[PDB]
Design a protein around this ligand. Structure first.
Ligand SMILES: Cc1nc2ccccc2c(-c2ccc(Cl)cc2)c1[C@H](OC(C)(C)C)C(=O)O
Lengths: 140, 149
């Protein structure tokens, strides 16, 4: 799997929306609770992702938040190729994420915090996805 | 010099608060406009950072937001040690970030957007000529080496 390809999807919990980004080649994940599943929030999420990791292509679930012209603008600016409707086949990752969230939920006063704790655990769990993504992306 | 050392601080622009984190060894930056400089926002910022990179130690100013019970709980949970030499780098980035923001501010309505655009531009920018690297390449390279050593 190309090192610049990310799978973009969503998942819901406690009446809240979580945007999920998975680095297909490593299984590394980035996720965050967002106010609403809108194009503006999705574009912002993508701009942050692209500025922290090499994002060359995103495969989305083709939800209306992704078909949004606002997201298209963000992708064009960041040089991201958007491919909608491409199923994840390296979400079952959403299940894993939800499972970990449950293991740390009572340690956080807010879901948003628990989600980040779950991402941390997932990425550092043993080679870990975190170690894998850096080894794959490293240029020198 | 260690790959797990980060310097954090804040900067103000347009009456808003920006939390900035710099990976000392690489110059790689993470920043974001936050509602207010509170302990809650700082802890959240830190947890997101720690889940992405191997944050071992953070050098911050002495503001109340960095020493709140929730920030300590977050650092405790993530295994992060809290500690002008330990702020000179991030302070330099505050200016560098502000400089880039001013160059693309017209390309976005909200400051929060321009901030992320600036972060992108800074981290992807190749330093030097042919043979040079970007800050984003440096942090990845540094960590990859540490993991395989
Ligand atoms: C409000 C907004 N509206 C838009 C409507 C149509 C197309 C693009 C945008 C962008 C836009 C502009 C530049 C890029 Cl690179 C990406 C999106 C923003 C953007 O806010 C976000 C980022 C919070 C949605 C901003 O602050 O300007």
């Amino acid at each position: 799997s190309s090192p610049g390809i990310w799978q973009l999807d969503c998942t819901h919990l406690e009446g809240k929306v979580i945007l999920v980004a998975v680095h297909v080649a490593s299984g590394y994940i980035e996720a965050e609770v967002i106010p609403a599943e809108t194009g503006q929030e999705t574009a912002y999420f993508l701009l942050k992702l692209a500025g922290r990791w090499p994002v060359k292509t995103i495969h989305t679930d083709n939800g209306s938040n992704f078909t949004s012209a606002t997201v298209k603008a963000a992708c064009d600016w960041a040089g991201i190729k958007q491919e909608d409707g491409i199923p994840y086949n390296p979400e079952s990752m959403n299940k894993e994420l939800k499972k970990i969230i449950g293991q740390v939920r009572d340690q956080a006063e807010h879901l948003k915090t628990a989600v980040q704790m779950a991402v941390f655990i997932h990425n550092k769990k043993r080679y870990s996805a975190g170690e894998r993504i850096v080894d794959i992306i490293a240029t020198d």
